[PDB]
Structure 1
Amino acid sequence: TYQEFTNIDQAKAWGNAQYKKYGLSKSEKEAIVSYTKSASEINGKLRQNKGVINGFPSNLIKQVELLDKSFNKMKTPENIMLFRGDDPAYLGTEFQNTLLNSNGTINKTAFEKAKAKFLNKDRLEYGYISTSLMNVSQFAGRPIITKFKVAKGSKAGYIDPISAFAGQLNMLLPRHSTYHIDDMRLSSDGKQIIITATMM
């Protein structure tokens, strides 16, 4: 049983309540703000290097170590569900230019091939995972929506107050996370794939 927030006021109150007691240091807050501005670049470098940071520039090694350390203070007090939007390349190079029909809907054949590739499989992410407490506007245009089931006691932080995209109920999960794909379905209007996954 995982808490899915369905009310914006409820989600914001819960998020603010967690943030109030983290006690993040000045340098930790600075590292997080900076991450939200350059997330795709940082996560891309982590993926290219399979999580090995020893050869990174000195500034970036420092930042990654601060982000990692930040999670010693940020844990969820209950089973929760988190949301994220992704573009077609998330499924592989063979889906980048095939997933979408010209009219914006998901191509049905490509959907079936993506389901065969990923359903009931584990996936390892070398980057951090930026998410939200709800299905928010910052990724309404994205063709893939993932709902992550995160267990009580797991590392997870409400970072909305120290995010460049404040107002979007922003949450962060740690790098090198693994999750199991439980379900993949087409939305009722055929414009998105909805994925359900359980975090390990």
Structure 2
Amino acid sequence: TYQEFTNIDQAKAWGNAQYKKYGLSKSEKEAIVSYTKSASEINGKLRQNKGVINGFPSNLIKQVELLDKSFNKMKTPENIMLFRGDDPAYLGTEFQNTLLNSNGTINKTAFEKAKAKFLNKDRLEYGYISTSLMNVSQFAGRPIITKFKVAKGSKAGYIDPISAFAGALEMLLPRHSTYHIDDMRLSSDGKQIIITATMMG
């Protein structure tokens, strides 16, 4: 079973308890802060280079390597569910402008195609993955919610306290992670795709 927080006070308490135990260095803390300030831009370069950072500038390599190594200290003590919201382009360029009907519902034919493309497949993310312990307004309007099943002992860091650029209840996952898409469904009001995926390392 995977713990899914349904109360924000419990979630915050649990995350803070993990954060206080990490024993991060000054330089690791600084690398995480720098990452939150440049997250979208850094993840793009990781994607273009397919995770190869050798060609990056010296200072950027050091930041990325510190961040990578900081995950040695940031592991979840239990099976946990993490949440992420995404826009249509997450499913591919072919879905960017076709996933939705004008009335705000997911187009059911596009959904069928998305399910055929991704269901029971593994996906590799070159960037780091930002998630949250709960879906509590920070993914408002996003048509795709992913629920990641993250096993006890997995690399995952509660960084909500570290920086003003960290998201609410943010759990950051390491770069170059692979997850398996277990299930894809529509929400009861037809306005979201809900994806369940099992995180690998």
Q: TM-score, normalised by structure 2?
A: 0.96
Runs of 4+ in 1 over 6 A off after TM superposition: none
Instruction: Tell me the CA shift for residue 84 of structure 1.
Output: 0.5
Instruction: Give per-residue Cα distances to partners, 1:137-176, cap 9 Å, x unaligned.
Output: 2212211100000111111110000133456101101011
Q: Which moved more, 1:13-22 or 1:136-145?
A: 136-145
- 1:129 pairs with 2:129: yes
Deviation at 1:114, TM superposition (A): 0.2
Say what the alpha-carbon RMSD is for the aligned residues: 1.1
Is the 1:133–1:171 contact (alpha carbons within 8 Å) kept by the matching residues of 2?
yes
Following TM superposition, by how much is the alpha carbon of 1:79 offset from its aligned partner in structure 2, in angstroms?
0.5
What displacement does 1:110 show?
0.5
Distance 2:189 2:177 in 1: 31
- Contact 1:76–1:157 at 8 Å: present in 2 too? yes
Asked whether the equivalents of residues 24 and 73 of structure 2 are also in contact (C-alpha less than 8 Å), the reply is yes
Deviations 1:23-56 (A, max 9, x none): 1111111111121122111111101100001111
1:61-98 deviations in Å (ceiling 9; x for gaps): 11100110110110111110100111111111100111
Q: CA deviation at 1:107?
A: 1.0
How far has the Cα of 1:59 moved from its partner?
Answer: 2.0
Aligned length: 200
- Deviation at 1:194? 0.4
Of stretches 100-109 and 74-83 in structure 1, the one that deviates more from structure 2 is 100-109
- Structure 1 CA distance, aligned partners of 2:103 and 2:164? 32
Q: In the TM superposition, what are the counterparts of 1:30-45 in structure 2 within 5 Å?
A: 30-45=30-45
Shift of 1:188: 1.2
Q: Is the Cα–Cα contact under 8 Å of residues 33 and 165 in structure 2 kept in the other structure?
A: no
Partner of residue 23, structure 1: 23
- Normalising by structure 1, we get a TM-score of 0.96
Give, in whole Å, the separation in 2 of the partners of 1:167 and 1:144: 18
Partners of 1:179 and 1:17 lie apart in 2 by 26
Cα separation, 1, equivalents of 2:59 and 2:99: 37
Name the CA shift for 1:177/1:166 in 2 (closer, same or farther; >3 Å): closer
5+ residue gaps in structure 2? none
Aligned-residue sequence identity (percent) comes to: 99
